[PDB]
Amino acid sequence: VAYSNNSIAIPTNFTISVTTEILPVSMTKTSVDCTMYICGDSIECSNLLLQYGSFCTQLNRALTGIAVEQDKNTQEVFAQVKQIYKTPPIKDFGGFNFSQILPDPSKPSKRSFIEDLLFNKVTLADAGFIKQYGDCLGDIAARDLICAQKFNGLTVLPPLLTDEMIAQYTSALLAGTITSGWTFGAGAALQIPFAMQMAYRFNGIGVTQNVLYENQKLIANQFNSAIGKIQDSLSSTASALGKLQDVVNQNAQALNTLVKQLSSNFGAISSVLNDILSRLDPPEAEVQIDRLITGRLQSLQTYVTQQLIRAAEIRASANLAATKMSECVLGQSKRVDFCGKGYHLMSF
Amino acid sequence: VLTTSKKQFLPFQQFGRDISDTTDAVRDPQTLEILDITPCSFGGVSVITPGTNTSNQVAVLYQDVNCTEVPMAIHAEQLTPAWRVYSAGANVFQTRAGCLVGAEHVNNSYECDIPVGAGICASYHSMSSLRSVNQRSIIAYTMSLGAENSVAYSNNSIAIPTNFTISVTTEILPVSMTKTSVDCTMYICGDSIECSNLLLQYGSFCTQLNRALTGIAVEQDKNTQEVFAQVKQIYKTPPIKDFGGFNFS
Amino acid sequence: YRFNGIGVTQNVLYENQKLIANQFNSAIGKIQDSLSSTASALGKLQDVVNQNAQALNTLVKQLSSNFGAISSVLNDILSRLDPPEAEVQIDRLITGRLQSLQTYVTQQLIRAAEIRASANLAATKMSECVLGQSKRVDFCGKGYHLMSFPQSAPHGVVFLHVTYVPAQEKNFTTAPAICHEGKAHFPREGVFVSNGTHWFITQRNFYEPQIITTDNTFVSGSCDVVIGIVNNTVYDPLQPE
Ligand SMILES: *[C@@H]1O[C@H](CO)[C@@H](O[C@@H]2O[C@H](CO)[C@@H](O)[C@H](O)[C@H]2NC(C)=O)[C@H](O)[C@H]1NC(C)=O
Ligand SMILES: *[C@@H]1O[C@H](CO)[C@@H](O[C@@H]2O[C@H](CO)[C@@H](O)[C@H](O)[C@H]2NC(C)=O)[C@H](O)[C@H]1NC(C)=O
Ligand SMILES: *[C@@H]1O[C@H](CO)[C@@H](O[C@@H]2O[C@H](CO)[C@@H](O)[C@H](O)[C@H]2NC(C)=O)[C@H](O)[C@H]1NC(C)=O
Ligand SMILES: *[C@@H]1O[C@H](CO)[C@@H](O[C@@H]2O[C@H](CO)[C@@H](O)[C@H](O)[C@H]2NC(C)=O)[C@H](O)[C@H]1NC(C)=O
Ligand SMILES: *[C@@H]1O[C@H](CO)[C@@H](O[C@@H]2O[C@H](CO)[C@@H](O)[C@H](O)[C@H]2NC(C)=O)[C@H](O)[C@H]1NC(C)=O
Ligand SMILES: *[C@@H]1O[C@H](CO)[C@@H](O[C@@H]2O[C@H](CO)[C@@H](O)[C@H](O)[C@H]2NC(C)=O)[C@H](O)[C@H]1NC(C)=O
Ligand SMILES: *[C@@H]1O[C@H](CO)[C@@H](O[C@@H]2O[C@H](CO)[C@@H](O)[C@H](O)[C@H]2NC(C)=O)[C@H](O)[C@H]1NC(C)=O
Ligand SMILES: *[C@@H]1O[C@H](CO)[C@@H](O)[C@H](O)[C@H]1NC(C)=O
Ligand SMILES: *[C@@H]1O[C@H](CO)[C@@H](O)[C@H](O)[C@H]1NC(C)=O
Ligand SMILES: *[C@@H]1O[C@H](CO)[C@@H](O)[C@H](O)[C@H]1NC(C)=O
Ligand SMILES: *[C@@H]1O[C@H](CO)[C@@H](O)[C@H](O)[C@H]1NC(C)=O
Ligand SMILES: *[C@@H]1O[C@H](CO)[C@@H](O)[C@H](O)[C@H]1NC(C)=O
């Protein structure tokens, strides 16, 4: 950089840039049947587990705490405003186009075109799909992992907030920000013309209001082009939402590894409870069964401990997402690089 | 459960084992027909109940079972009569979370009281037939996100407040947790002279547990110090003086 | 100064000082009544004490379990078995009891990290809201933060957040700029509003209509560039003198 005591550089133009920040809010909620995983529905087994029942209760208590936290994390990020602002019939917004981000009425789930692209990019089909006992029983030939974990007592609990409800919360925040700007976040929403609200945002970053009014047509066109570029980038790049895909992959991998742990024998003659029961009388059988029970309990304990550490990381990201929603979506933030590189104007 | 198996074993092969190593498929000894082996239980039961003091009424939710398949899944025919009532029809409601029985579905939407899941919530409510005798029953309803509202937006219209409200709100944040220390020998040996001779090798593990606990204890004191010791200067409260009429006593 | 920070003029506080003091006193009284009449107020602090007590209680319960040993009582094994046979049974109890202690320590470490994050937020809240006025939205309570008061609580800190919330509002016609004589005029700190036949400049937060004047507004460019410009006269204080 050319530095001089009497030299300064002043911009004679400006660029409007839209950037995407992705933060994980929640992780899959899972519950484990201790007897089904260790005993495998064996009548002889679970008589030994009666003393170990207290340990199983502790594992269930930790898992239930993670599940309630995930619902709370989603609620904090999307339920900041209880008032659901109905999207108005589109009115002149100064030439700014928000139809792509606004929910589409003529489609299922009432979700935005950008939201539809994001849903397509992340594959949750691999992580789980509804399985009836009949569906698993009929499809014996295909070894789907979801049926195998369900048979071993590992199951996934559906989130309390449905995707449609999350979309309705997102639409309400979007409607409030365009129509009333920062006013809806604190106190009752007060309607303001979008161009006048945009001038206030320019005043916040230290640019005079007149510059926005004279260049309003150019500013609206630059914003529309940036939104179009973002949708094209999401559609043409498969690897966009990497963090969200990683969260689903880690949870599915952890359940799959637990099913694999059953194959291991912890010093027992066989890893199959049935084989030990068939070949050994009960006093000799108990010693071998106890070795399998202790190892299987340890595998469940290791899985629960990993889930608790993952939940803490997800909780920190969810807290940041809630802070980002209040600071950038409900207000203009003067923090540097908190709401994107450059001087923040607004966030959707 | 035994079912016919599409998979065919090679002549040397007599039985099949899955990834878990359980015998997924077996061949009948008398007849060479492969039979798949399936666990009888599928799992998935939750009991939604108001406090037992308030009522003994309960609602049962099956996560993976449709209302038609509910009796077969739980083997209701061989179950106790009280269990059969929970598998009985007329209270069955089908949800994405699963079939829910013992709860009366209501169109009205309320703030969630107990979370069934998939946008469905259950509450104990005063639903009375004929509205002449008060009756209490569990109800299943879609949760209410909030009151629907529409902002009136115009290119030349603005709303400006002509008054204001001063509001005081309380935010509670945990600063510290109880500090605890564990005597490894006392907990495991229970003051036994014979015990602890074996623990001499395991002493290193006990030292590791004590080191982690001591670190938590010092952190809790540090957490309290950071929040309350921001200013070392202790400002003496002045005899109360006029504060503009603001009361802080 | 706090009112000036949220964008409300100092004069509004001075004229309404008696009302502002009464509203603050009423809010403090409402808070004390709510705490006294509602048992379930400090849920998070109670949960922290309950979790710690539950963890110690479960550890005492774990002693009852026997990890493949003939008895969970060390004394019974010692009484019925000679030392070589007794050692195998004692070792099974020792390994299981050590595992129970290890599980408890691991849970405590995860809980300590959650408490540490909350304590760090509390320290940030104390510096940003108690020692200063924070412009962050919803960091120091809903509404425009004015000041915060810390109150000591067991295992926690309770923050009383005093905030300014806009009350009743009215509808007013608005224009981005005023065309006085072929020159666009933009309001320096206010929004142009019309009661219906007259145009005034007022602060957005509170309604204080004022006659448009050369000091009140700045003139930039020409009327044609502004899309919503409307015709009005800008008064000049210098011209009568
Ligand atoms: C600031 O940059 C903008 C955008 O690059 C310029 O607007 C362009 O003007 C040229 C004509 O010179 C047109 O061909 C382009 O279509 C305009 N861009 C868009 C996207 O509308 C603008 O001219 C620049 N301003 C200055 C002071 O040079
Ligand atoms: C906002 O942008 C969208 C997408 O560019 C515009 O939607 C187009 O609408 C026309 C009809 O007016 C259709 O023929 C196009 O297929 C739509 N998409 C595209 C890619 O052009 C929408 O009209 C824009 N909103 C306004 C009012 O400008
Ligand atoms: C702004 O709000 C305050 C508080 O509500 C109003 O002051 C009160 O008005 C009511 C209505 O008559 C009186 O009964 C109270 O005695 C007043 N004082 C208080 C502290 O409640 C005030 O009048 C309102 N101002 C406007 C512009 O309407
Ligand atoms: C500030 O408020 C307190 C109450 O919290 C006032 O103290 C007295 O409180 C009792 C009830 O607890 C009332 O019966 C008294 O009337 C209150 N004071 C008096 C002398 O009337 C305290 O006086 C208030 N401070 C001021 C100076 O207004
Ligand atoms: C300011 O104007 C808006 C729009 O006219 C008002 O909002 C409407 O108020 C009427 C009154 O009955 C309702 O029927 C409408 O449903 C409201 N919204 C719409 C979309 O028209 C608003 O109430 C006015 N402000 C005040 C102070 O009344
Ligand atoms: C809008 O505000 C103006 C203030 O300019 C009001 O005009 C006043 O009207 C009253 C009587 O109607 C006169 O006594 C004042 O001298 C006027 N003030 C002036 C000329 O500055 C006007 O009444 C208000 N209302 C409407 C509907 O226009
Ligand atoms: C606001 O005032 C301007 C300036 O007086 C008006 O502009 C005139 O518009 C008429 C047609 O309505 C033209 O014939 C003149 O050439 C314009 N200039 C002048 C100097 O008179 C304008 O009509 C007024 N109204 C609006 C809505 O802008
Ligand atoms: C055994 O006898 C049964 C009944 O007669 C017959 O169905 C089966 O094929 C026989 N299997 C062998 C081993 O021959
Ligand atoms: C049940 O709870 C209520 C308070 O909600 C209490 O008054 C009542 O005593 C409780 N019942 C019993 C049997 O203690
Ligand atoms: C089972 O219930 C679900 C709703 O939870 C429904 O979509 C499905 O069609 C029903 N039928 C099946 C597949 O058993
Ligand atoms: C509930 O809604 C359905 C569908 O609109 C309707 O058929 C039914 O009569 C309504 N009433 C109740 C409480 O079932
Ligand atoms: C405001 O909206 C009306 C109705 O659509 C329109 O006639 C008028 O030209 C618009 N004015 C501006 C400032 O865009």
Side-chain angles (χ1 to χ4, degrees), chain B residues 1 7 36 65 77 82 87 105 107 115 135 151 156 171 184 231 244:
Chain B
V1 167
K7 312 169 177 295
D36 273 329
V65 195
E77 70 286 334
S87 69
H105 175 56
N107 290 358
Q135 301 169 4
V151 181
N156 47 22
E171 177 171 356
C184 205
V231 283

Side-chain angles (χ1 to χ4, degrees), chain A residues 17-39:
Chain A
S17 173
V18 173
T19 56
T20 67
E21 177 171 356
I22 313 165
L23 293 170
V25 170
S26 58
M27 51 181 278
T28 76
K29 320 182 310 182
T30 57
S31 54
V32 170
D33 192 11
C34 205
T35 172
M36 206 168 188
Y37 179 88
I38 305 178
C39 295

Side-chain angles (χ1 to χ4, degrees), chain C residues 1-219:
Chain C
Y1 176 88
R2 307 308 183 102
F3 261 51
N4 207 8
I6 69 183
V8 183
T9 50
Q10 293 183 352
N11 69 286
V12 171
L13 176 125
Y14 289 122
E15 57 213 18
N16 292 41
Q17 180 176 337
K18 299 295 296 299
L19 180 66
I20 290 171
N22 295 353
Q23 289 193 19
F24 166 77
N25 296 352
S26 301
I28 286 295
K30 204 168 305 299
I31 286 304
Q32 76 147 359
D33 296 347
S34 176
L35 289 170
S36 182
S37 303
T38 309
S40 183
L42 291 87
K44 304 181 182 179
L45 262 40
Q46 187 66 36
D47 289 355
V48 170
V49 320
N50 293 348
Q51 284 173 350
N52 296 154
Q54 170 190 104
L56 289 175
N57 296 336
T58 203
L59 212 49
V60 178
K61 279 173 278 189
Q62 307 293 27
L63 287 165
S64 73
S65 73
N66 45 79
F67 320 93
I70 56 158
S71 179
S72 63
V73 187
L74 233 66
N75 292 348
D76 291 0
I77 301 179
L78 296 172
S79 306
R80 299 177 52 181
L81 295 179
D82 61 342
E85 177 57 42
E87 281 181 17
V88 183
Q89 313 292 323
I90 301 302
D91 204 270
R92 294 168 175 177
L93 283 185
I94 283 184
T95 51
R97 287 171 181 183
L98 247 179
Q99 175 63 44
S100 304
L101 291 178
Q102 289 162 358
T103 305
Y104 164 79
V105 165
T106 302
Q107 296 275 354
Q108 291 286 96
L109 286 163
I110 303 170
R111 287 203 184 99
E114 177 72 26
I115 293 298
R116 173 66 176 178
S118 181
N120 294 345
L121 181 62
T124 307
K125 200 133 310 185
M126 182 78 66
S127 58
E128 300 192 16
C129 319
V130 178
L131 316 183
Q133 194 177 17
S134 176
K135 308 300 172 59
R136 302 173 56 176
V137 181
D138 288 9
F139 188 67
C140 307
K142 202 177 186 301
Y144 303 107
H145 162 254
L146 291 169
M147 58 193 325
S148 298
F149 304 114
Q151 290 291 287
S152 73
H155 284 327
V157 52
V158 171
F159 285 105
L160 306 177
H161 300 286
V162 184
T163 57
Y164 173 103
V165 179
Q168 54 240 27
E169 64 268 350
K170 278 204 38 182
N171 281 351
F172 285 117
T173 308
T174 184
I178 286 302
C179 193
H180 173 46
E181 38 196 21
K183 305 197 304 294
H185 279 80
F186 306 93
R188 298 177 181 267
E189 83 295 326
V191 153
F192 291 138
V193 291
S194 185
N195 68 339
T197 69
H198 287 91
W199 281 93
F200 306 103
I201 166 186
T202 175
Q203 26 169 1
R204 298 172 168 90
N205 283 351
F206 193 77
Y207 184 55
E208 194 77 11
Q210 283 184 350
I211 297 98
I212 307 179
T213 59
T214 62
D215 46 285
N216 287 352
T217 68
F218 69 92
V219 35

Side-chain angles (χ1 to χ4, degrees), chain B residues 104-108:
Chain B
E104 171 203 7
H105 175 56
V106 285
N107 290 358
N108 313 331

Side-chain angles (χ1 to χ4, degrees), chain A residues 36 82 84-86 91-92 131-133 140-141 143 150 159-160 162 169 191-194 263 272 275, chain B residues 7 17-18 20-21 24 36 41-42 64 66 69 96 118-119 145-149 152-153 155 157-159:
Chain A
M36 206 168 188
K82 280 314 180 169
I84 309 296
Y85 296 109
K86 185 57 186 179
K91 268 215 56 175
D92 191 58
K131 293 298 155 53
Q132 214 174 17
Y133 176 71
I140 290 302
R143 299 171 164 268
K150 197 77 65 60
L160 172 58
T162 190
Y169 275 131
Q191 72 266 5
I192 186 177
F194 189 79
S263 73
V272 187
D275 291 0
Chain B
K7 312 169 177 295
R17 292 199 179 276
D18 66 347
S20 72
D21 284 6
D24 69 324
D36 273 329
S41 179
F42 198 64
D64 302 313
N66 286 58
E69 322 291 330
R96 256 168 296 175
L145 300 190
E148 190 65 41
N149 195 211
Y153 170 75
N155 57 4
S157 177
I158 195 184

Side-chain angles (χ1 to χ4, degrees), chain A residues 12-14 218 221-222:
Chain A
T12 65
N13 218 2
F14 57 78
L218 180 66
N221 295 353
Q222 288 193 19

Side-chain angles (χ1 to χ4, degrees), chain B residues 10-62:
Chain B
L10 271 314
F12 77 106
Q13 299 168 336
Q14 196 263 334
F15 66 102
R17 292 199 179 276
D18 66 347
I19 177 68
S20 72
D21 284 6
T22 203
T23 320
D24 69 324
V26 75
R27 187 204 301 269
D28 186 89
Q30 299 185 340
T31 60
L32 271 71
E33 175 201 5
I34 322 296
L35 296 165
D36 273 329
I37 305 177
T38 308
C40 317
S41 179
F42 198 64
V45 42
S46 57
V47 182
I48 310 170
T49 172
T52 209
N53 166 22
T54 311
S55 187
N56 284 8
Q57 299 180 28
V58 297
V60 187
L61 172 75
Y62 315 90

